[PDB]
Design a protein around this ligand. Structure first.
Ligand code: HEM
Ligand code: HEM
Ligand SMILES: Cc1cc(CCNCc2ccc3ccc(N)nc3c2)ccc1C#N
Ligand SMILES: Cc1cc(CCNCc2ccc3ccc(N)nc3c2)ccc1C#N
Ligand SMILES: C[C@H](O)[C@H](O)[C@H]1CNc2nc(N)[nH]c(=O)c2N1
Ligand SMILES: C[C@H](O)[C@H](O)[C@H]1CNc2nc(N)[nH]c(=O)c2N1
Ligand SMILES: [Zn+2]
Lengths: 413, 408
């Protein structure tokens, strides 16, 4: 590979030079003859697989703290090496855990919020043994991160994978999400994205209120055991009713959303160690709710209803009634969060901050991997600066990864 | 291997085999994706390329290994041997041109690919000739508002010193002027080209929407200036169906998007001059041309007139203004009976096209970064459509601006 790759911004003419891509560790899925950049997704580590992965990470940590080649560095290498030899795995120090979590975020190509990467509260839950204990750790996380509306980015990290039959898993895709219910007539109540998970919860014993915005229970698996249900205390679940600054009728739509986006189904990989339960949270970009959650056809799908209340001509697509309604909905989401003082960022601010982050990263780190397809917001793409910015995408480690759904793999006891 | 693409909204899963055919590089590697980067002969090289193309042409007309097929390969071989090149048949030319369009991974309008009027201009020898061919193209394609896709193909490259080139980036574009106070009048995208026209003798009206002259290079000679006859230039005054004040902005655009700086490659042959044209998707003008910061940049002016609060970005004043502008553009073109497609309609057609191509051809190369419209992305079906990008030939390629290579 070429040592220097250039990216250009076609709006500002600014040219950046990437050297960091040489540290790329895994495959993107693309080849020389085909690009898979719009594909959504294109038994444990053996001792010999584990050695060089650990060393790579340890070197990286010690390089970051300006102690590369030091006695403490060489000693840590030796201690790790001996641990893998005698136990087939190793345990990270707290400092290394914190560094690795922050870097998984820093390395997340698809995240437009990474300017904040170094400000991440890390909770070490590696001493947790039961699903009840996971619940306790999770409640504390939610309360800390919510902070009465002044959100704080955080991650809680449960014990790493051992033999793969003792995995810790949060079965929820996010800590807070709304139930979806399929009706006998084929219609869907609540959030259609969550129907499958909802059915599992009901089967596991959950009594469903069967409403439109029912906060799902936690379904928590510890040490490879069967998962257990827990209700999050409602006072810990911060929600915002959606209203519009001009349209008095908007509140009559009865919409609301939760303040804390807290993804709980990813896998954190550090130094070849695998943390299958590592729920993390930041705060929302408005479009996540206003465009995707509300206006996707396979989600809440509210465009028609809003357009009708806006008295728009909905007969021809060329009237842009959809686009017109889309903007008002996103105005409403941002207005409601700001009014209740719950942290949220609009897509203009977020993308402008990302450009500055990207430029800084190129300066100090020699690059910043970015997935344009994900970075560009789902509305008004070209009026944000990221649209015009060439990006290079590649995978650095530590990283957040997708993993299979736990109900697909779990061995029921 | 067979590759699958999934639509995440419909859950439809298509299977791509067509990608196995590509031999050209994309720029990405196993470790680095360049999907958002805008830009990632000899007898010996020439014959296999010719052979590949003849083969797929005769394969496409259901006569692979026919008597005609064998003879053509032999004929082409002799011609490359004895002349260092070869000439396409008319049929091959037309097939080649339609397929370059079909294979254009960045084009959302490809449902139309087989409907393309091909104007053969390979007998052209002078800039005056080029002008004549171009006028006929514009007149035919414009068709009084009922636009018709067309391509005019000028003689292929020989030694590189005698290229035919249309120096304009589009046949019809507006001039851009650098003002004493450092601002720009008209279209900033064309400031450089405009300056070259001025220096070559063009007397500029110095307005906001001055139709540029044609600057035409034939056979490697110095380019020459021509004024397109105004009656051939269809333009649309932009008004809004609800905001009576919108027409007071004095905005307009031309009806015919006619890209003129690309290179058409067929069977190893290079057509450095091949202006082609279709019709507009509204966002091209309403989002990019009008609202890009580096273009006409009208958002602030429009938002003023809408009396929006422009203090905080979270008011989404830009997004509001953007929608209204695009409403105006569509309404204006439609009211004037000038062909235009909205991004909802176009992306919808593109999905149907993809379905067609997977069914009959085994896939469809597509560049999601370009296919998804620059506004309202995820409320169009292409946002939710996984796409595989790969390079098939015949193709349209970029080439350098002629003023960076030409000696006078
Ligand atoms: C602090 C404010 C943050 C903002 C505004 C933000 C913004 C975003 C947005 C808008 C996306 C696209 C999500 C989607 O469309 O589904 C995203 C993706 C992502 N974010 Fe961030 N984020 C923040 C914090 C975090 C944190 C704290 C982490 C981890 C420590 C993180 C890691 C990721 C990852 C791994 C993805 C890719 C998600 C996927 O592939 O499904 N982000 N972020
Ligand atoms: C008939 C109606 C057509 C529509 C609605 C349409 C639509 C579009 C749009 C919106 C783009 C993106 C352009 C940009 O953002 O700059 C594009 C790209 C492209 N189109 Fe089409 N198009 C049409 C006809 C054609 C024709 C007739 C040809 C050639 C024979 C063609 C070949 C291409 C190529 C090569 C690109 C890529 C341009 C580049 O790489 O800069 N299209 N099309
Ligand atoms: C349909 C689908 C969607 C997704 C995106 C989920 N990722 C959301 C996410 C992740 C991290 C975030 C961090 C901050 C924030 N505001 N939003 C964040 C949102 C993944 C997989 C599939 C599948 N299959
Ligand atoms: C600034 C820049 C822009 C571009 C995109 C031009 N693509 C226009 C185009 C091409 C073909 C079209 C076909 C139909 C249509 N409606 N519009 C069509 C518009 C490429 C290179 C550079 C550079 N440097
Ligand atoms: C098909 C396409 O890859 C898919 O719809 C992607 C596009 N870009 C995205 N970008 C973000 N931020 N989030 C998404 O879910 C998606 N979906
Ligand atoms: C940097 C990025 O590749 C560039 O801005 C692209 C993005 N997608 C695009 N898509 C279309 N249709 N037209 C464009 O000019 C661009 N520009
Ligand atoms: Zn790629």
């Amino acid at each position: 590979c070429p040592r220097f790759l250039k990216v250009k911004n076609w709006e500002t003419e600014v040219v950046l030079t990437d050297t960091l891509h040489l540290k790329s560790t895994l495959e993107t899925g693309c080849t020389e003859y085909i690009c898979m950049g719009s594909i959504m997704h294109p038994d444990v580590a053996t001792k010999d697989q584990l050695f060089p992965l650990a060393k790579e990470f340890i070197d990286q940590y010690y390089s970051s703290i300006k102690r590369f080649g030091s006695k403490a560095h060489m000693e840590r290498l030796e201690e790790v090496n001996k641990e893998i030899d005698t136990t087939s795995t190793y345990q990270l120090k707290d400092t290394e855990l914190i560094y690795g979590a922050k870097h998984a975020w820093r390395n997340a190509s698809r995240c437009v919020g990474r300017i904040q990467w170094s400000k991440l509260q890390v909770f070490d839950a590696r001493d947790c043994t039961t699903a009840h204990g996971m619940f306790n750790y999770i409640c504390n996380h939610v309360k800390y991160a919510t902070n009465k509306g002044n959100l704080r980015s955080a991650i809680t990290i449960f014990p790493q994978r051992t033999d793969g039959k003792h995995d810790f898993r949060v079965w929820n895709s996010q800590l807070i999400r709304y139930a979806g219910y399929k009706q006998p007539d084929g219609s869907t109540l609540g959030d259609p994205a969550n129907v499958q998970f909802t059915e599992i919860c009901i089967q596991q014993g959950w009594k469903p209120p069967r409403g439109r915005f029912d906060v799902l229970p936690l379904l928590l698996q510890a040490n490879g055991n069967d998962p257990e249900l827990f209700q999050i205390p409602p006072e810990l679940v911060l929600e915002v009713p959606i209203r519009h600054p001009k349209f008095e009728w908007f509140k009559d739509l009865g919409l609301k959303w939760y303040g804390l986006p807290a993804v709980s189904n990813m896998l954190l990989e550090i130094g070849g160690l695998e943390f299958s339960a590592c729920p993390f949270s930041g705060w929302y970009m408005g479009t996540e709710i206003g465009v995707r959650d509300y206006c996707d056809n396979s989600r809440y799908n509210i465009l028609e209803e809003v357009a009708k209340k806006m008295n728009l001509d909905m007969r021809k697509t060329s009237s842009l009634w959809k686009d017109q309604a889309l903007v008002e909905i996103n105005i409403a989401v941002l207005y409601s969060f700001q009014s209740d003082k719950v942290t949220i960022v609009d897509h203009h601010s977020a993308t402008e901050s990302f450009i500055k982050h990207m430029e800084n990263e190129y300066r100090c780190r020699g690059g910043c991997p970015a997935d344009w397809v994900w970075i560009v917001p789902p509305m008004s793409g070209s009026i944000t600066p990221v649209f015009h910015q060439e990006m290079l995408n590649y995978r650095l480690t530590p990283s957040f990864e997708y993993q299979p759904d736990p109900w697909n793999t779990h061995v029921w006891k």
